[PDB]
Design a protein around this ligand. Structure first.
Ligand SMILES: Nc1ncnc2[nH]cnc12
Ligand SMILES: Nc1ncnc2[nH]cnc12
Ligand SMILES: Nc1ncnc2[nH]cnc12
Ligand SMILES: [Cl-]
Lengths: 269, 269, 269
């Protein structure tokens, strides 16, 4: 079944690694610098991994040491706007679960709709809105092997990990924001009317990923921490043209702070 | 076509029954007690019915007498979160239509977002929000054999049936609420941010069913009455973990009142 | 690929035509009268066009002269509620692009939710809400041959074309409204609760088309102008039953003004 696929994937991964990570990190598009801070023990290209989706817009699974602990890092992820199903988008999370990963740190780039946000701000995700997503990764003809049929979503981002983020940030003098993330499919950016409405719904930041992974991670009983880099501002009255290159550059600008935050958080787990 | 399938299904059902019900009832998950009040003339397991979807999370069609009238009762229904298409979810409604059912009573369990609601409250559905549903049961390459191409939805829950509910409830001293139901796919429950936004949109109760059936029933010209059992409270500031067992228990608590209400309504039609 | 299909389609069209239109017009359902004002040089039934979707609820591509300029007119379009994929819905726009069309004028019928709107009003679309659409025409496994991967949507309806509309309308004494259009799938009309919520989101008019085309046109770098005929009023407190025949009749009522507006706009380009 899906269980047999996951077994095959994890068996392949276990044959390459000797570390036993209990922590996993999904790096957002344009946020690969963390891998430089990582003492890399094993590198596994996505193309070699059984049942992983082929050819992402290379993709690498890295196993090594960070903040004095064993971690697995996904460099590259699968996006719904690339034409992957939600099951493919979230397959790596199921794999991390079966590897024994208990804590998942997810980062992404997002548009800031909160008026106090500036480009390059780091925003801890304390909640999300998932209801715009057109396909749900939990819709399966059969009940789950692991977890509840109808998982509770009253705390999808674990409070202790949010508090830890803020503790570390205060200690390192990293300004840190928090708020509600809303997932859209993309790939087109949002209209002015859309930004206005999303803000009115209570969203602080909008992005094109992450939420499916967090849903699956919570259903599987993992502890999740999520963080957005604010790469562009989405104030509809003063909205200008956004450009992928500027978004990537802005993401890169914030990476040193993000890397430092994440390393020190892991160090403290 | 789909017409030929429906014929085959109804032909099979007609071969088992001798009653001529003009009233149909869809029982929500965790609300089977009504079948005890039913004088059952015929029992038809879902697994034996041509073109019905296989294996629900048994499923029975019961034909008998309730409130002095012939009725058909669906014990068990098909949910989008179980992986059925919207066409499969609503196929039983098309079948009831072709059987000659004119009045449809639909019940479900829902989360209460209206601050005056308490667990076990009965809420008459006076309107719904369907726009979060990711697939629409009316999207067909061919125009419908029965009904309008673009059906009006200014009164999806017939006023006379709502008034009747309230009349019966006052007479039996059953407290009765009313409000707007919003359908989500699930199967995960909603986040705090999601509950806040849904309430802000004007929803009173949120559930994972019913709306597709009501859309098809209205398109087919049937009279619909809908009622939710409030099984859990969804006030986002004071939200606690929900559990399937507690939701089912709460549903069961409300069933005697619901059964009494429904029997006396049917008695009065 | 999709590129080869488009080539085949355009090659077929080029073999029938001798004009070189740089302007394209998509006529909304119930708004065919513009073709009477058109000096028709070539008529191409949809059924003969390679890779066009078969059998619409005839369909014709007309090439001719209007407002002293060469134009292509789509009489008949493909709707998501008819069971076509979003790729099929927007294929004609890709074809117009490959024909060299730079300016696209799109018209439709819509329900008016702005309290100042009356039936037969013309409303220029100055922005849209696309996030209810369940499938996105840009979700492709491969990056686009033309355009950006993540197109900006800060100005999906070109300001100069909106200003031109208003200039022409003032000159011809045509009252003209403007506002935000929201796309829904249909085919059922909206409930009272839905009209209330859509208005609250900031929509002025709601319809069952157009947005997919505008997204693709903008991604392909075309200039878009959009206009709705308000065919029915959607004030939820005073909502009455809508009927397709009355909607079509109302659309027809507004056509002379719309045709005059469009001809004089094209004349001025
Ligand atoms: N404005 C935006 N909208 C959606 N996703 C984004 N990712 C980064 N910026 C974004
Ligand atoms: N809170 C809730 N959300 C969605 N569906 C439900 N069914 C019962 N309770 C529910
Ligand atoms: N009220 C309405 N809703 C959706 N689409 C429409 N097209 C015309 N009127 C409409
Ligand atoms: Cl709102």
């Amino acid at each position: 079944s899906m269980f047999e696929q996951i077994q095959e994937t994890t068996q392949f991964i276990q044959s390459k690694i000797t570390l036993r990570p209990a922590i996993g990190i999904i790096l957002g598009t344009g946020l690969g610098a963390l891998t430089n801070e990582l003492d890399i023990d094993t590198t596994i290209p996505y193309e070699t991994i059984p049942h992983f989706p082929l050819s992402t817009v290379s993709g690498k699974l890295l196993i090594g040491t960070l903040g004095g602990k064993s971690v697995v890092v996904m460099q590259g992820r699968f996006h719904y706007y690339e034409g992957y199903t939600m099951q493919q988008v979230t397959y790596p999370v199921r794999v991390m679960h079966a590897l024994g990963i208990q804590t998942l740190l997810v980062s992404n780039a997002a548009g800031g709709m909160n008026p106090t946000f500036q480009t390059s701000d780091l925003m801890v995700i304390d909640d999300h809105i998932s209801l715009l997503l057109p396909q749900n990764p939990l819709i399966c003809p059969n009940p789950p092997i692991f977890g509840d049929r109808f998982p509770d979503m009253s705390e999808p981002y674990r409070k202790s990990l949010i508090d830890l983020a803020f503790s570390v940030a205060a200690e390192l003098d990293i300004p840190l924001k928090r708020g509600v993330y809303v997932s859209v499919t993309g790939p087109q950016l949002e209209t002015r009317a859309e930004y206005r409405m999303l803000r009115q719904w209570g969203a602080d930041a909008v992005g094109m990923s992450t939420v499916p992974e967090v849903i699956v991670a919570n259903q599987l009983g993992m502890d999740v921490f999520g963080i957005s880099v604010i790469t562009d501002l989405c104030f509809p009255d003063t909205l200008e043209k956004a450009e992928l290159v500027k978004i990537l550059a802005t993401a890169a600008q914030a990476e040193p702070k993000l890397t430092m935050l994440i390393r020190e958080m892991i160090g403290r787990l």
